[PDB]
Design an enzyme around this catalytic site. Structure first.
Site, mmCIF file in Angstrom:
data_model
loop_
_atom_site.group_PDB
_atom_site.id
_atom_site.type_symbol
_atom_site.label_atom_id
_atom_site.label_comp_id
_atom_site.label_asym_id
_atom_site.label_seq_id
_atom_site.Cartn_x
_atom_site.Cartn_y
_atom_site.Cartn_z
ATOM 1 N N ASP A 53 -6.566 6.475 -4.740
ATOM 2 C CA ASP A 53 -6.080 5.115 -4.930
ATOM 3 C C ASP A 53 -6.150 4.668 -6.381
ATOM 4 O OD1 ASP A 53 -8.657 4.216 -5.283
ATOM 5 O OD2 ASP A 53 -8.759 3.048 -3.509
ATOM 6 N N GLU A 67 0.764 -1.217 0.000
ATOM 7 C CA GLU A 67 0.000 0.000 0.000
ATOM 8 C C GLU A 67 0.817 1.301 0.000
ATOM 9 O OE1 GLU A 67 -3.008 0.004 -0.264
ATOM 10 O OE2 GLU A 67 -3.746 -2.012 0.205
#
Ligand SMILES: [Cl-]
Ligand SMILES: [Cl-]
Length: 162
Positions: free
Chosen positions: A20, A11
């Site tokens: 994202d 991540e």
């Protein structure tokens, strides 16, 4: 290697609101804020999450705190889930990390929908499960991360992350 270090590689860490891979407002270590298009709805969620007026930016400690909550919630969701729990219970320690990783990324609901792969994992049919897991939007959308998780399931080692 452990779950935290694994997810940290997958991540990354960003201390300012970002978008994202799906275009959603996120912050820290993959902490989804909102699916709404509004940057303001994102700053609002952010401030609610941190307990202070953040102006879209947080510190490392704050990011790590969100991350601790998120891993904890991921594990607890697996344990409360009727479809997930039996899978998790059957797996070794490394493979358990791989399932936690999927849930952190896609939510309990999404993972629980991988019916066929789940059954193959439970039966310990590694190679077959790896093949089935690849036939997913998930693999198509984030192929490098998916391959890493998949390899973790197939092998049972942390090779893909070393
Ligand atoms: Cl929260
Ligand atoms: Cl990827």
């Amino acid at each position: 290697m452990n779950i935290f270090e694994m997810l940290r590689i997958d991540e990354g860490l960003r201390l300012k609101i970002y978008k994202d891979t799906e275009g959603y407002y996120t912050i820290g270590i993959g902490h989804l804020l909102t699916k709404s298009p509004s940057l303001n709805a994102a700053k609002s969620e952010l401030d609610k999450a941190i307990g202070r007026n953040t102006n879209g930016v947080i510190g490392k400690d704050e990011a790590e705190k969100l991350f601790n909550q998120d891993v904890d919630a991921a594990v607890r969701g697996i344990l409360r889930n009727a479809k997930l729990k039996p899978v998790y219970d059957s797996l070794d320690a490394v493979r358990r990390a791989a399932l936690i990783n999927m849930v952190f990324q896609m939510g309990e609901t999404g993972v629980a929908g991988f019916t066929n792969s789940l059954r193959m994992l439970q039966q310990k049919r590694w190679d077959e499960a790896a093949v089935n897991l690849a036939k997913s939007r998930w693999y198509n959308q984030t192929p490098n991360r998916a391959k890493r998780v998949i390899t973790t399931f197939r092998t049972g080692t942390w090779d893909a992350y070393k």
